[PDB]
């Protein structure tokens, strides 16, 4: 059991939760890769069979009565069927775990308070579409976000999958220009050549909203407006930098993932989009300042008159702060919720305390976990951590196109 | 099963094809990631034949001449003896090539330019200091600073063992209370007290440089005084906050990690300090800035009149930049070698395409190579990293004691 260390404290811990890690990830003893961003009914029967006995863990009822009649119920069905269906309790409490268990989620102090949509009925992409407004609509809540997860029918024999094609419900443009450059977000090139592709009238903005692109199964894509008004978005000034809300920058409210696989007791949920809230640092610091971003870091730092022409200077550090700033005013002045690094990283650490109580230890992706800026700043940064992948999941999915 | 590599910046590619040698194993397995953590006879003939192997490669004299050669004479020295003496040159290019393989070393583009002192026939704590006085003035040079490594005598059986009794050559001491708490350094107070048992007379202050506890075989340790004309050090100041100087912050010029155990062709020097230059971040931000180091954040913000009272203001971060600004601008000012962590990191991903060519990739860990402070600012926070052990290495080792 790997012994784990917290170096501001002087805290030892022993993760014995790892040693039940059942799928396996890119480490060997020889060499090290967690750096990385992107690490038959017997087996569905023991992946099925254990979650079911952690479903029955968690209500106090282990080994008895419905627990045993769960497990012959799954074994029967899978057996008739090649498959299984979900109890909406156990569905409840499956979408719970995947987020308890993602490793690269520092916001899991929250991971009991999700409200769970079963859309597993949907039945089309324009029931898909009505699912997911609701959804956007239920936890945006004005800018009191509420944590929600909308889960789409399962993978199953016979049938394709219901995918979302965009990686987020909520995402911006990125227009490859005339001069090879990208007009907005350029993470999103790819799936608003998509939209393009699949008759969306392009805008010209660096903020325009992307159109969905919903795949029911066995279907093409179809393309849906989101409406205006369920995609609240937060025009981003600084309180004291007034020349700031002159760049014309915004961001939206709701981080809503949603191109991931929800995976629960060998099921395979491949459309399931889940939201929470931000981190100051995903927008003020990832989604503005990356160099294959927004990349505003050298505008914000020339506007400060900054010294842009020696790094000594920390311009790069003063400007990002900065904008971290303005990113978090802008969410409070707007009433839309935001957590900074800070604040983030203390409640994920006892979060951690929570989880060492609770299971023994807790999955937890440190390169992740430390925000990328002011890291030795917050507390995870002098704690040790042990990454590995404890199911129900959300794992990553290759692009369906 | 050569781990592609992958830039986020840029979206280049590559292949860690050195991975594959990795002679020792690092505390990672398919079941759980542990690269977070700190700590994570004639078996000698193996490692030293591997050695004289790469030694003769890298000056182009593969199987030829003195390779065959110098085969027979560790044969015969290990035959006879039971271990070997590294010819000069050997002991200098595997000097250069543990630099060279330091995962945790952002500095290593310099991995070539390192001066080694063979203090190998080195008997006596006197005779230590002495060594380590030269090194430490030679290193120091009137603050242009010179990466040095002085190797001191080998390891073998029957006999004690060169240790140096202190993390680095330059420590400051951390002395407790009538109340538990520290004065100056608290990553010292263990050292700081040993060298009070051994007789030394306790400064008051917060930043007493600390005695050298040096140690010969098989004798008790030995107190030493440093000359204080040859413990440069940088009084700390801020270029735009009158005040910061007033607050009496001081760092040493050189960073002389004197506790780790060098390894070439098997061979162990559990003294063999190397030295080189710091890089800001280490004393801005780790070094005063810890909670469980010197934890001057708040007093630093407290005299930028910055809101404390709630984490979002980003006080923490704003006054972390600035002691930053103030090691640069200070260290500038007396003209002491520093690199800024953005230079730093900048050279190290020269380094990465250098040792890509070279030697088809490079062991390196991110927690380590991203700085803690603006992590994704720095091109290495994007750039995927493989670890691996390569020899020869600087190994960790236990405290004599
Ligand atoms: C409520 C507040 C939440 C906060 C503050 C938060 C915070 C974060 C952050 C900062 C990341 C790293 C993302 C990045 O840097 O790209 C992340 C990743 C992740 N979170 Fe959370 N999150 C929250 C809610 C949720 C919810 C509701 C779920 C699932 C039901 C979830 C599951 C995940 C997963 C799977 C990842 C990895 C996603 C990826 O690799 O792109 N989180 N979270
Ligand atoms: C000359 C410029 C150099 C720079 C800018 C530099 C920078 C750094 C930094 C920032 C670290 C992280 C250590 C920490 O944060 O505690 C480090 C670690 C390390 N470096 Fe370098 N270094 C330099 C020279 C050298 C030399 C000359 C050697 C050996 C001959 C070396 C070998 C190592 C080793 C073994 C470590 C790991 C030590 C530990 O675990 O505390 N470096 N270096
Ligand atoms: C290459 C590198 O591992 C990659 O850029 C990672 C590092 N850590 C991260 N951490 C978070 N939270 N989000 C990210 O996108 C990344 N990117
Ligand atoms: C717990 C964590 O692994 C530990 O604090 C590491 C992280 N990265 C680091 N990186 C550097 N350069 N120096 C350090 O001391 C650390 N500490
Ligand atoms: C639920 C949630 C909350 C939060 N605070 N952040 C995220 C995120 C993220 C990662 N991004 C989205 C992607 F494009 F898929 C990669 C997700
Ligand atoms: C050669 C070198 C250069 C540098 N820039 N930094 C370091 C360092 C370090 C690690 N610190 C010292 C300790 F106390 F041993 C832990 C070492
Ligand atoms: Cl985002
Ligand atoms: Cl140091
Ligand atoms: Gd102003
Ligand atoms: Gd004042
Ligand atoms: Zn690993």
Redesign the interface.
């Given at each position: 059991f790997?012994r784990?260390?917290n170096?501001?404290?002087g805290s030892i811990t022993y993760?014995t939760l790892?040693?039940q890690?059942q799928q396996?990830?890119?480490?060997?003893?020889?060499?090290?890769?967690?750096?990385?961003?992107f690490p038959a009914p017997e087996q569905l029967l023991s992946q099925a069979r254990d979650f079911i006995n952690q479903y029955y863990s968690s209500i106090k009822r282990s080994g008895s009565q419905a627990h045993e009649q769960r497990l012959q119920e799954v074994e029967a069905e899978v057996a008739a069927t090649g498959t299984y269906q979900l109890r909406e309790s156990e569905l409840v409490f499956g979408a719970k775990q995947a987020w308890r268990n993602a490793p690269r989620c520092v916001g899991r102090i929250q991971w009991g308070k999700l409200q769970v949509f079963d859309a597993r009925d949907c039945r089309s992409a324009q029931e898909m579409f009505t699912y997911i407004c609701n959804h956007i609509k239920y936890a945006t809540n004005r800018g009191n976000l509420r944590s929600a997860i909308t889960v789409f029918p399962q993978r199953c024999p016979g049938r394709g999958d219901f995918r979302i094609w965009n990686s987020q419900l909520v995402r911006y443009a990125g227009y490859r220009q005339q001069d090879g450059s990208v007009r907005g977000d350029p993470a999103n090139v790819e799936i608003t050549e998509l939209c393009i592709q699949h008759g969306w009238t392009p805008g010209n903005g660096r903020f325009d909203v992307l159109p969905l692109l919903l795949q029911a199964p066995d279907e093409p894509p179809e393309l849906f407006l989101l409406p205006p008004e369920l995609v609240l978005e937060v025009p981003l000034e600084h309180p004291t930098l007034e020349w700031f809300a002159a760049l014309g920058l915004r961001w939206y409210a709701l981080p809503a993932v949603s191109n991931m696989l929800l995976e629960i007791g060998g099921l395979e949920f491949p459309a399931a989009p889940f939201s929470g809230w931000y981190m100051?640092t995903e927008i003020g610091?990832?989604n503005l300042?990356?160099?294959?971003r927004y990349n505003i870091?050298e505008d914000v730092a020339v506007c400060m008159d900054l010294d842009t022409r020696t790094?000594?200077?920390?311009w790069?550090?003063?400007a990002?702060?900065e904008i971290?700033?303005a990113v978090?005013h802008s969410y409070?002045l707007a009433k839309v919720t935001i957590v900074?690094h800070?604040?983030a990283t203390?409640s994920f650490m006892k979060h951690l305390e929570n989880e060492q109580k609770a299971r023994g230890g807790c999955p937890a992706?440190?390169?992740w976990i430390?925000?990328?800026?002011?890291?030795?700043?917050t507390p995870v940064?002098?704690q040790?951590?042990?990454?590995?992948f404890l199911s129900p999941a959300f794992r990553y999915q290759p692009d369906p196109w």
């Open positions: 790997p784990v260390k170096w501001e404290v993760d790892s040693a890690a396996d990830g890119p480490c060997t003893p020889r060499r090290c890769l967690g750096s990385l961003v100051s610091t990832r300042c990356d160099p294959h870091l790094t000594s200077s920390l790069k550090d003063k990002a702060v971290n700033v978090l409070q900074d800070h604040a203390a992706d440190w390169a430390v925000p990328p800026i002011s890291g030795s700043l940064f002098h040790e951590m042990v990454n590995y």
